[PDB]
Ligand SMILES: O=C(O)CC[C@@H](O)C(=O)O
Ligand SMILES: [Cl-]
Ligand SMILES: [Mn+2]
């Protein structure tokens with residue numbers, strides 16, 4: 001009883017009919033899978049996207065990783081695929097003194113949790129993690145070169161992870177702001193023990209991960225409802241990770257044994273994802289894991305209509321924590337409203353409900369700041385400002401609906417929750433900067449209603 005493996009997460013094997021629409025399928029399994037945080041999806045047996053690449057022309061800059069439980073790592077920050085693969089196979093082979101396909105997955109798991117907890121061991125490994133570029137592209141077929149019929153079959157698949165974030169049931173689709181770190185797929189070259197620390201996705205989005213080829217990836221996941229339980233356990237064991245961070249490039253994360261969570265009554269599930277299988281993580285579902293050997297995976301974030309209310313809650317949670325946003329949720333909502341006529345109807349219906357809450361909150365906030373003595377106001381096109389020029393001084397939220405400025409501190413803004421935090425001038429010197437009047441906003445919401453019918 002060194003390591004007691006968590007119970008297995010749900011595994012789905014959709015029929016071709018079920019599989020034909022990824023968003024319908026994800027909606028269908030949600031009641032089950034949101035209880036476990038992660039789930040595994042095996043596509044129909046003949047869904048087999050062709051993979052092809054020259055192992056000598058693909059190069060990438062590896063990240064180095066120390067394997068110590070509870071030690072701080074930063075979430076985001078030269079080999080060819082062949083030379084990495086050679087290093088990776090030799091590492092595993094020498095570590096166990098065995099051929100690679102002979103090392104049992106149970107053993108690699110048990111040994112991982114041993115080595116990260118033992119101070120005397122100092123194993124370091126390497127891995128790749130980068131968004132698709134011309135130097136290293138998607139593992140799925142994309143359009144340009146002369147493609148074979150096989151590749152053409154998979155070009156428009158919903159499960160082709162390049163398409164997932166442009167589909168009609170997707171919400172993150174119409175965002176015009178630059179969120180490239182979030183809407184483009186990431187490519188991951190793994191090796192034995194290379195690991196991803198406990199985290200949730202930005203803005204509590206979904207993620208979906210496809211293992212193109214190689215040895216399995218071992219996952220642990222925690223359902224969304226238990227996120228704060230996990231954070232409380234982790235805060236007690238590693239408070240350093242929870243100090244305020246200067247930006248998004250300084251997110252601190254760590255390796256932590258799932259048995260520790262289970263001891264503290266945090267529900268945790270596991271799975272081994274093999275080549276050709278999907279793993280899906282649900283909103284605010286903590287997950288971590290490690291690779292069993294040399295492999296190649298591809299993952300992307302996405303947001304469904306189910307996620308919309310959670311996205312709003314997330315930004316509220318970021319504000320309470322003074323965490324930076326990747327994008328403005330309200331700006332996304334208003335962009336969609338301005339495109340109501342071309343929106344999918346269920347999407348239009350869900351956006352309308354979120355917009356109604358947005359407007360009612362904004363109404364109350366503006367009444368409050370008026371009572372504080374802010375009188376002067378001027379329209380402002382917040383979406384034109386670079387993000388770093390429209391973050392609240394206090395809580396760092398990305399402003400869009402409104403903010404307060406003072407001629408006293410040129411360029412500085414606070415959101416309407418932090419009117420007292422801008423400067424020492426009396427509020428009558430302040431200006432309310434707003435994107436829309438309430439009277440602009442109600443017709444926008446009405447367009448959505450008409451589209452939703
Ligand atoms: O985070 C990683 O490094 C692996 C990707 C995983 O977190 C995912 O959400 O697909
Ligand atoms: Cl160690
Ligand atoms: Mn993730």
Ligand SMILES: [Mn+2]
Nearest residue numbers: 319320394395
């Ligand atoms: Mn505060």
Ligand SMILES: [Zn+2]
Nearest residue numbers: 392395415418
């Ligand atoms: Zn603020």
Ligand SMILES: [Zn+2]
Nearest residue numbers: 406408423425
């Ligand atoms: Zn001032």
